Each structure stands twice: as structure tokens, then as C-alpha cells.
Design a protein around this nucleic acid. Structure first.
Lengths: 62, 80, 92
DNA sequence: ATCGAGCTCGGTGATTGGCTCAGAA
DNA sequence: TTCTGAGCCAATCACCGAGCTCGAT
């Protein structure tokens, strides 16, 4: 991961420092390495709870 | 009419420790900028979907737009 | 750091994505996930230039001019007016 | 004076998964 | 062809925005 003027001239130097910023966050802080299947325990329990119509969809009146 | 969470745009800017106070107008500009960005990225990627005769836009469609436009050069180590 | 703390909501992103295309069209999940990452990089990218130019002028608050200037600097000079325009129909 | 960080609070749309067949392969 | 994976529904609740107080420029 590295290159010189083989990228937008205008943009070059920023990309560079932003590489630094991330390489920091990675090294130290917390950048989630992988995506979670769901985001909130409760919205999962609620989606699991909902009555479902035909086709695995939610429902609607009749 | 369109929208995007202003609060979230902020939360994202403020990931940087160098970035301390932020004006009100800023996220508001960014809402629209991101909107134009997301809009004109997708637009470009879809060409590559139609080129290939698919009806589903996919990750690699995207990478193929990034590589074909200088203005998007800054996403290189975002999408390998 | 949670996902909700560092990306725009996915459905907000898809919504817009879906507008950009044939109404009949489809979009991969991995596609949406991807733009979502990008847009977050785009946000951060303009900022670090703005933060540079904004602290370079001995100020402490990133404002309107800052962004727009950063955008000219990085080749988004095309976005500049339509924002300005859209910047006169929401403020006072 | 103005203009932002950081609370709190209440109103609301993003989040969510199973079945089906577009459509990627 | 085979068979993987996106769209489709709408009810809860985390998060957003509109009010605040306070301390800075």
C-alpha cells in the first residue's frame, strides 16, 4: 500500500495523512474488523417476534 | 425533502481528534454533498452493470467506477 | 466503536442509491455496504483538508467557507455552486 | 452580543428476517 | 441449465432534532 503521483495530483497529500489517521485508529482504537449480522439485540428479538403473512413478509389486513 | 441524519454526519467528522468545534451549516452542506456523492457514484457503477448485461449492481461494479474516475481516487484503500 | 457510530444508516444510503438507477433495477447488499463505507470516507476526507485549512487560519470552528474551499482544493469544485445554492434555501 | 458542546426528552422512521423466484453463475 | 441472495412487508424503540443551560469568542 503506497504510491506517488499515480493518483489525482490535487488529492495526493490528503490521502496520505488519512492513511495515517486510519493506521492509527487500527493500531490503537477500535475499527470493527467485520460486520455484525444485526445491530441491536432488541430489534432482533422484535423481528423474530412479528407475525408473518404469506411469502415470509410481515402481514397486512384483509 | 431529502435528508440524512445531521447528528450522524457530525459524529463521523468528529472521529478525528484534530476536529474540535463544528459550525451548524457544515453537516447541512455535507448532507447534500454526500447525497450528490452517493448519487453520482452509483450512477457511474450501474453503467458497468449494464455493460455486463446484469440487472444487479454489485461491489465490483463499484470498484470499476473508482478506477475509472480521478475524482474518486481517494477511495483506493477503501475498496480493494 | 459501533457501526451506528461511524456510518450513515444503510437504508438511508440504499434509498438514495435506488434513486440513481432504473426503477426496475436491483442492488447487492455488499454493494450497499460498500457505498456506505465510501460515503463515510468522503465525509472524513473533505474534513481533514478543511481542518487543515481551518486551523491554518488560526480559527477553531469548521464552517461553510471551509468545506467549499476544501472541495475546490480536492477536485470537487463541480459540487461547489449547487451546495451554495442549496445553502441559501435553509439558513438565515 | 453570537454561536457550539453537551445534556435531556419525546416522537418516529431505520431496522429487521423468511419465503420466493429474479437472475448471477 | 443450478442454486444463491435481494426484495418485500410494517411494529417496535434507539436515535435524531428541537429545546434547553453554560462557557467561549
Amino acid at each position: 500500500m503506497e504510491e506517488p503521483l499515480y493518483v489525482n495530483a490535487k488529492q495526493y497529500h490528503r490521502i496520505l495523512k488519512r492513511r495515517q489517521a486510519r493506521a492509527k485508529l487500527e493500531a490503537e482504537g477500535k475499527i470493527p474488523k467485520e460486520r455484525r449480522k444485526y445491530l441491536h439485540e432488541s430489534r432482533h428479538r422484535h423481528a423474530m417476534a412479528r407475525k408473518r403473512g404469506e411469502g415470509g413478509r410481515f402481514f397486512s389486513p384483509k | 425533502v431529502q435528508e440524512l441524519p445531521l447528528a450522524r454526519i457530525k459524529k463521523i467528522m468528529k472521529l478525528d481528534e484534530d476536529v474540535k468545534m463544528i459550525s451548524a451549516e457544515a453537516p447541512v452542506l455535507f448532507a447534500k454533498a454526500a447525497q450528490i456523492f452517493i448519487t453520482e457514484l452509483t450512477l457511474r457503477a450501474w453503467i458497468h452493470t449494464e455493460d455486463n448485461k446484469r440487472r444487479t449492481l454489485q461491489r465490483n461494479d463499484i470498484a470499476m467506477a473508482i478506477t475509472k474516475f480521478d475524482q474518486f481516487d481517494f477511495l483506493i484503500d477503501i475498496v480493494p | 466503536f459501533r457501526e451506528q457510530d461511524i456510518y450513515l444508516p444503510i437504508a438511508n444510503v440504499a434509498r438514495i442509491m435506488k434513486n440513481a438507477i432504473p426503477q426496475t433495477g436491483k442492488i447487492a447488499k455488499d454493494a450497499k455496504e460498500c457505498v456506505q463505507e465510501c460515503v463515510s470516507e468522503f465525509i472524513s476526507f473533505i474534513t481533514s483538508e478543511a481542518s487543515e485549512r481551518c486551523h491554518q487560519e488560526k480559527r477553531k470552528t469548521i464552517n461553510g467557507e471551509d468545506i467549499l474551499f476544501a472541495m475546490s482544493t480536492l477536485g470537487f469544485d463541480s459540487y461547489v455552486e449547487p451546495l451554495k445554492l442549496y445553502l441559501q434555501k435553509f439558513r438565515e
